[PDB]
Each structure stands twice: as C-alpha cells, then as structure tokens.
Amino acid sequence: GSISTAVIDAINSGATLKDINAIPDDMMDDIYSYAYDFYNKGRIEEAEVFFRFLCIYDFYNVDYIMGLAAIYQIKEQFQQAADLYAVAFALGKNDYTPVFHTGQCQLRLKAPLKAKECFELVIQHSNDEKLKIKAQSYLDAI
Amino acid sequence: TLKDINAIPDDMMDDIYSYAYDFYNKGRIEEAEVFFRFLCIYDFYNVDYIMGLAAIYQIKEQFQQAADLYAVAFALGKNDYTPVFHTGQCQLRLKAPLKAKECFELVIQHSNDEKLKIKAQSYLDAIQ
Numbered sequence: 001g002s003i004s005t006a007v008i009d010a011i012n013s014g015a016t017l018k019d020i021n022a023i024p025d026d027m028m029d030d031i032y033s034y035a036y037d038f039y040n041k042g043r044i045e046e047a048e049v050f051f052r053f054l055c056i057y058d059f060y061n062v063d064y065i066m067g068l069a070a071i072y073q074i075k076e077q078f079q080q081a082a083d084l085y086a087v088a089f090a091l092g093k094n095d096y097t098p099v100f101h102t103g104q105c106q107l108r109l110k111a112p113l114k115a116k117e118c119f120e121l122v123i124q125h126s127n128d129e130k131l132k133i134k135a136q137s138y139l140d141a142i
Numbered sequence: 143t144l145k146d147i148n149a150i151p152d153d154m155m156d157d158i159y160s161y162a163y164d165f166y167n168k169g170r171i172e173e174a175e176v177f178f179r180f181l182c183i184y185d186f187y188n189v190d191y192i193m194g195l196a197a198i199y200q201i202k203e204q205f206q207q208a209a210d211l212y213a214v215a216f217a218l219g220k221n222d223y224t225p226v227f228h229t230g231q232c233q234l235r236l237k238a239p240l241k242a243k244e245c246f247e248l249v250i251q252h253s254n255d256e257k258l259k260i261k262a263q264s265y266l267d268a269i270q
C-alpha cells in the first residue's frame with residue numbers, strides 16, 4: 001500500500017520521482033481533480049487508483065492522503081484508513097478532522113479506548129465547534 | 143511483509159534488533175544502517191524498526207529522510223509523540239523553525255510522556 005511504498009522509498013533512499021520533479025504541480029493538481037471527479041460519481045475503484053498514484057508521487061501531501069483515507073473508510077478497510085488519517089494529522093497538525101475519523105475507525109476496529117482518546121483530543125484542542133459536537137456524540141455512546 | 147509469512151522466527155528477529163541497537167550504541171553507524179534497513183524490509187509496519195532507521199538518517203544529517211520516516215512511525219503508533227519531537231529537531235536543522243515550533247507544540251499538547259514534554263519545552267523556549 002501507500003505506507004509500504006513510502007517506507008521502501010525511504011529504505012532504498014534512491015532518487016524518487018518527486019526528487020527529480022517528474023510531474024509538475026499543475027499536472028498533479030489536474031490529476032487530483034480527476035480523482036475527485038471519479039470519486040464524486042461513485043467510481044471509487046478508479047478514484048482509489050488515482051489517489052494511490054498521487055500518493056506514490058508525493059506521499060507527504062495532506063490532500064492526497066485524506067482522499068485515499070476516505071476511500072478506505074468507505075470500503076470498511078478501517079485499519080488502513082486509520083493509519084492514513086494519522087499520517088494526515090501529523091502533516092496537518094492543526095486540523096482535527098483526521099483525528100475524528102481515526103476515532104470512528106478505531107470504534108469499528110473494536111478499540112474503544114483508542115477511539116475515546118481520539119474523540120477527547122478533538123474536544124480539548126479543536127476550534128471546530130461542529131466537529132466537537134460530533135466527537136462528543138461518539139464519546140457519549142462509548 | 144516478510145513478517146506476515148513468519149520468514150524468520152520471532153526470537154531471532156529480537157536478536158537482530160538488539161544487534162542493530164548494539165551497533166548504534168557503539169557508533170558503528172554503517173552497520174546499524176544495514177541492520178535497520180534489513181529490519182524495515184522484513185516488517186515495514188514495525189514502529190521501533192522504523193524509528194531506528196529514522197534515527198540513523200538523523201545522525202547522518204539526512205534530515206528530510208528522517209522526518210519522512212518519523213511521519214510514518216507516528217502514524218503507525220498513533221499515540222507516541224517521540225517521532226514528532228525528533229521531526230521538530232529535523233525541522234530546526236532544515237531551517238524551518240515555524241514547522242519545528244508546531245511539532246514541539248504538538249508534543250506538549252498531546253503527549254502524556256512528561257520527560258518527552260520537558261525536552262520539547264526546552265526546544266520551544268529557545269525558538270526565536
């Protein structure tokens with residue numbers, strides 16, 4: 001998957017496609033928009049390929065990671081989704097949306113203590129009042 | 143992964159990790175790097191294996207490579223902010239002090255590791 005690719009790239013430490021500027025920003029932006037065209041039409045399998053392609057080129061991009069994580073959550077691949085949401089959070093320190101979704105995934109993974117920690121982080125640190133209500137509704141049910 | 147098919151026994155993998163750390167502690171960086179690369183090929187999803195290779199890259203002043211691995215290590219472990227602390231150090235070396243500040247702030251806001259937070263605060267205090 002995307003994470004294994006990132007680690008292999010790191011182990012081998014060779015020239016990556018991004019390191020050589022193999023695809024310009026404008027083209028990457030276009031491909032990202034195409035990925036969501038597929039996604040928005042329910043063509044989740046094509047969208048997944050396009051987001052995997054984006055994540056091979058530039059894994060450390062919050063927008064690419066969040067798109068792929070969303071697909072895995074929809075497909076009920078909850079551990080892969082949680083792992084990617086956690087990457088997205090590390091890259092995007094100030095957005096607690098990936099932490100909220102990690103909590104949802106942890107609940108489906110039968111890990112309520114991890115989920116509780118996620119939802120509590122949202123309540124204590126997010127400035128998104130609507131996200132906080134949603135996190136509290138999950139907390140109330142745990 | 144090779145771990146998924148149990149290609150090497152568990153006890154032998156523990157030995158190899160301990161040998162990797164022995165090389166690391168003795169300053170035998172080239173050998174530790176081989177051993178941590180071996181471990182990460184065997185199980186890319188082992189946070190401690192990733193952290194070891196990331197540490198080697200940081201010592202070698204390959205700061206971006208280290209930060210990239212620390213991001214994966216953080217994600218897999220979810221609740222351990224040690225990789226975030228080391229990323230902050232890497233960002234300082236990469237002349238990205240605002241990114242470093244965000245890393246150290248994240249450690250202090252989320253971590254339950256008091257000794258780690260003391261270290262993070264000492265870096266924050268020094269950031270201009």
Ligand SMILES: Fc1ccc(C2=NNC3=NCCN3C2)cc1F
Binds near residue numbers: 060210211216226229
């Ligand atoms: F906690 C972390 C926060 C950011 C990063 C990062 N690593 N690598 C990286 N490449 C482009 C942006 N970016 C941030 C790693 C962490 F471990």
Ligand SMILES: [Cl-]
Binds near residue numbers: 095096126127128
């Ligand atoms: Cl937020």
Ligand SMILES: [Cl-]
Binds near residue numbers: 238239241
């Ligand atoms: Cl900066």
Ligand SMILES: [Mg+2]
Binds near residue numbers: 124
């Ligand atoms: Mg608040």
